[PDB]
């Protein structure tokens, strides 16, 4: 075999740190890669050496496979792990690595190329004999052929069409012995949706739940399938929350899922770690092949919590390095046993209220949930970002992954709830509120959720706590104090103090007024939305005198008269005030009040504009008539004894020319009328 | 049976912190109670929310059982542990 002492990573993020960590235990060197800048990132602070690769766009960075290979050769690298994304699925890169002599980590290039095309892949599995639900059989040569194979090839009837998602030819015709309505439905589908007259028939499944078993193989002909998984929950083809132990799955089935999976991988030949994905209908009770991926998934640490080998913790990445080592395995499929249950959820730096659009901004304060064991449950968090970091728009929005291992499902789900609640980030809106809403009200604790489970409950979700009038009181107070000495040393005569804050909550401005009575800075009141009360407030140490973009992060205490007390860590800026406490997190936008403060001119500008002196001789006018002029460009240039003396009018609005180039004009002539755009 | 998610403590001191701790493992909410001032005390820095009850003498503080019950009802508390004393 070939010795390995240097490890190379392609991608960046959580996978970089994960690959780097275990490496320490195996006692192997590490190498990091980073784009323009991106040098303060954590992963590079974790490796032994890092190299800059070039411009931010993914074409420029992490896609120059030849340059990466040349750099690795110059470094005499032993192994490369592509990870997921970028060159994860590219057979040319793997072949070039093999020619260079470096041990590529993953499947051979032949398997990747074969699975690149869906038609040839499904051909291979059909030849292998695995139950596969195909996409098409022939064409609509005859309408009687539809009745011929309707009860033949596939009893379930999937009429549909050659293409297009309209699918009105379907009509949900699950009843066999249908011969006068299927042809009428197809012919009415052909109208206004002719496309190609060829029609394909398949089996139609009422329900769908996604399954995906894991597998592992050495290069000495020996492997063992890991435990199954579930990915029923996904929105817009994006993974949201998943469970390694498919609840409600019989043991016997588990076993069989393996025999089918091993047949397919052996047929194409496979080395390393991979995952086979199925599609399943509860009503039919059978699973049909949909797709496979020849690449390590992102969901690898999840399935790990439900599998132990020889009573020892399993490390998936470890074996992949050992597989690259050339050593053979040590365990049969038997040594592996499941223990308990676990759940996972992904947090995305997106805004749930909006069109789930990514946002980029500095990370102000990041609470870290307790990543230790307690009670009947294990909870962990893996994050590829830390304090002081900033999200890049080029990358996908992905902060951290939270997993709750437990002895029973209940324990696991309950654990997450509390953890999901505890983790807190300030600075960018996240979907963390959405995930908690997905966990509390939906009765998916039973364990039965379909592929389209998210679609129906959209009305129930997308809901957040209501900002109580009290929340404005602590939020408003923090912005003042966390900016200046408002209410500090203040003093007037025979009167009392007053200071107000305007919040632009939703599309309606909000005003909050704060004032004091007595000689007390401590005793304070409030009146928001016609609700009045009293409270006292005690601050903490003063921090962040520089009041930069991060501004001031301080803890606050508020004793309201009723009797309560509160603690609030407020990082306030001019744009917004963020308050985090037992209520949760809420950011209140401050009413924006900016509008070219100075240049606010509504003057008509009717006549006598950019008038030229006596000599005249206007020429070389470079402004189009009827075009807005707010900045002071040279509207007209007139020459008086070689005196260009450009007028440079700054009156806003479009300018209308009444003169032409080369025309001698009199003194103080109306060359143009600079009027407000009407 | 009846679900519990909010825990209420009557007394103050070592018992407050002890009752509060295990609560974290069961994953249950917590509530603290404190007399005049007595807000820098540790137990309140351990709970989720704390309420002031009134004057230092034990007659005034921790003995207005009716007021404690009304406050707990307003908070929709699930359970109360009196402790000792």
What does this structure look like?
This is part of a larger assembly, with two copies of chain A. The first copy, chain A, has 14 helices and 28 strands. The first copy, chain A, is an alpha+beta fold and 678 residues long. Among the domains of chain A are: 109 residues, Rossmann fold; 249 residues, 2-Layer Sandwich (D-amino Acid Aminotransferase, Chain A, domain 1), CATH 3.30.470.20. In chain A, the strands form eight sheets. Chain A has a six-stranded antiparallel β-sheet with strand order 21-22-23-24-25-26, with helices on one face. The first copy, chain A, has a five-stranded parallel β-sheet with strand order 3-2-1-4-5. Chain A has a five-stranded antiparallel β-sheet with strand order 7-8-14-17-16. In chain A, helix 2 packs parallel to helix 3. The relative contact order of chain A is 0.07. Chain A: Its cofactor is biotin. Chain A: One of its GO terms (molecular function) is methylcrotonoyl-CoA carboxylase activity. Chain A: This is Methylcrotonoyl-coa carboxylase biotinylated subunitprotein-like protein. Chain A: Keywords: ATP-binding, Biotin, Ligase, Membrane, Nucleotide-binding, Transmembrane, Transmembrane helix.
């Amino acid at each position: 075999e070939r010795k390995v002492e240097k490890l190379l990573v392609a991608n960046r993020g959580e996978i970089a740190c994960r690959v780097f960590r275990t490496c320490r235990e195996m006692h192997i060197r590490t190498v990091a890669l980073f784009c323009e800048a991106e040098r303060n990132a954590k992963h590079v602070a974790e490796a032994d050496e890092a190299v800059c690769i070039g411009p931010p766009p993914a074409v420029n960075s992490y896609l120059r496979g030849e340059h990466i290979i040349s750099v690795a050769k110059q470094l005499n690298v032993d192994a490369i792990h592509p990870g997921y994304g970028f060159l994860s699925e590219n057979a040319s890169f793997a072949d070039a690595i093999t020619r260079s002599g470096i041990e590529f980590i993953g499947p051979p290039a032949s398997a990747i190329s074969l699975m690149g095309s869906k038609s040839e892949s499904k051909r291979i599995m059909e030849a292998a004999g695995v139950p596969v639900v195909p996409g098409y059989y022939g064409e609509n040569q005859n309408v009687s052929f539809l009745a011929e194979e309707a009860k033949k090839v596939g009893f379930p009837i999937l009429i549909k069409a050659v293409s297009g998602g309209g699918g009105k030819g379907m009509k949900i015709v699950e009843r066999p012995e249908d011969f006068t309505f299927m042809l009428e439905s197809a012919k009415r589908e052909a109208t206004n949706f002719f496309k190609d007259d060829r029609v394909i028939l398949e089996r139609y499944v009422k329900r769908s739940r996604h399954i995906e078993c894991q597998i592992f193989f050495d290069k000495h002909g020996r492997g063992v399938f890991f435990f199954e998984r579930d990915c029923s929950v996904q929105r817009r083809y994006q993974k949201v929350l998943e469970e390694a132990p498919a609840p409600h799955l019989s043991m016997e089935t588990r076993q069989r899922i393996g025999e089918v999976a091993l047949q397919a991988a052996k047929a194409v030949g496979y080395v390393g770690a991979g995952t086979v994905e199925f599609i399943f209908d509860t009503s039919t009770g059978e699973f049909y092949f949909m797709e496979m991926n020849t690449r390590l998934q992102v969901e690898h640490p999840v399935t790990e919590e439900v599998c132990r080998i020889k009573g020892a913790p399993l490390d998936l990445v470890k074996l992949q390095i050992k597989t690259a080592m050339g050593k053979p395995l040590t365990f049969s499929q038997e040594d592996v046993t499941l223990v308990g249950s676990c759940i996972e959820a992904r947090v995305y730096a997106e805004s749930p209220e909006r069109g789930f659009l990514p946002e980029s901004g500095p990370l102000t304060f990041i609470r870290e949930p307790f990543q230790g064991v307690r009670g009947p449950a294990r909870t962990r968090l893996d994050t590829g970002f830390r304090e002081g970091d900033n999200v890049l728009i080029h990358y996908d929005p992905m902060l951290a992954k939270v997993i709750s291992w437990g002895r029973s499902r209940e324990e696991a789900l309950r654990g997450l709830r509390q953890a999901l609640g505890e983790y807190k980030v300030a600075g960018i809106n996240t979907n963390i509120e959405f995930l908690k809403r997905c966990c509390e009200t939906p009765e998916f604790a039973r364990g039965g959720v379909t592929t389209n489970f998210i679609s129906e409950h959209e009305s129930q979700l997308l809901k957040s706590p209501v900002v109580t009038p009290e929340v404005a009181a602590m939020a408003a107070t923090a912005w003042l104090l966390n900016r200046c000495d408002n209410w500090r040393g203040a003093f007037r005569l025979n009167s009392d103090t007053n200071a107000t804050v305007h919040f632009y909550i939703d599309d309606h401005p909000v005003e909050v007024r704060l004032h004091t009575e007595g000689a007390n800075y401590h005793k304070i009141f409030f009146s928001v939305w016609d609700h009045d009360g009293s409270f006292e407030v005690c601050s903490g140490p003063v921090t962040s005198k520089h009041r930069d973009q991060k501004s001031i992060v301080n803890d606050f205490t508020f004793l309201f008269e009723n009797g309560m007390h509160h603690t609030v860590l407020a990082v306030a800026t001019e744009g917004d005030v963020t308050v985090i406490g037992s209520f949760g997190l809420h950011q209140l936008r401050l009413l924006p009040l900016t509008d070219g403060f100075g240049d606010s001119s509504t003057a008509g500008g009717t006549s006598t504009k950019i008038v030229s002196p006596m000599p005249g001789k206007v020429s070389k006018l470079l402004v189009k008539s009827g075009d807005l002029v707010e900045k002071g460009q040279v509207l007209v240039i007139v020459e008086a004894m070689k005196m260009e003396h450009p007028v440079r009018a700054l009156q806003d609005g479009r300018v209308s020319f009444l003169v032409k180039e080369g025309e001698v004009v009199g003194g103080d002539h109306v060359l143009a009328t600079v009027a407000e755009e009407e």
